[PDB]
């Protein structure tokens, strides 16, 4: 119903605050991307590895 989007809105906001306490550097837009990839079964350590290298080679460009 319409009550599932407020639920997802609440969890995404909990997650973003968790993400901020941990100082991950993620914004809400990229955090949502990460959630969907994890739900689809991308290994989180693979995803962490990818994100860290895509950062390491962008301030360098």
């Amino acid at each position: 119903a319409a009550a599932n989007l407020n639920a997802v809105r609440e969890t995404m906001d909990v997650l973003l605050e968790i993400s901020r306490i941990l100082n991950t550097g993620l914004d809400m837009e990229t955090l949502s991307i990460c959630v969907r990839l994890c739900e689809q079964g991308i290994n989180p350590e693979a995803l962490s590895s990818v994100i860290k290298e895509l950062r390491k080679a962008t301030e360098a460009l």
């Binding site: 968790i18 941990l22 995803l47 990818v50 950062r55 080679a57 460009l61």
Partner: protein, 96 residues
């Protein structure tokens, strides 16, 4: 299908490459996917994630950051109610 769009957005977003017709976009994308398909990690251990979460809570308490400890416990408790919970948390822990 939406996976593939998500990986492209992840590259644009994280690597700051907004033009898919940049060879550097495609090189970053090939690297991301090749990384994803090189299975080399054990699957996420939920018990180990839970121990780490509880460890972060102790550290906040030890340093008398009460408003952060209470926040930490409140958010993680709320989140951990409705496998992907621990995979998401593992990613955030890895990015800390």
């Amino acid at each position: 299908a939406q996976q593939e769009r998500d990986v492209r957005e992840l590259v644009r977003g994280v690597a700051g490459l907004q033009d898919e017709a940049d060879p550097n976009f495609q090189l970053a994308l090939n690297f991301a996917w090749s990384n994803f398909r090189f299975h080399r990690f054990l699957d996420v251990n939920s018990h180990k994630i839970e121990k780490t979460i509880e460890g972060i809570y102790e550290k906040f308490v030890i340093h008398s950051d009460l408003s952060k400890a209470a926040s930490w416990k409140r958010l993680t408790e709320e989140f951990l109610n409705a496998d992907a919970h621990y995979s998401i948390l593992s990613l955030l822990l890895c990015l800390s």
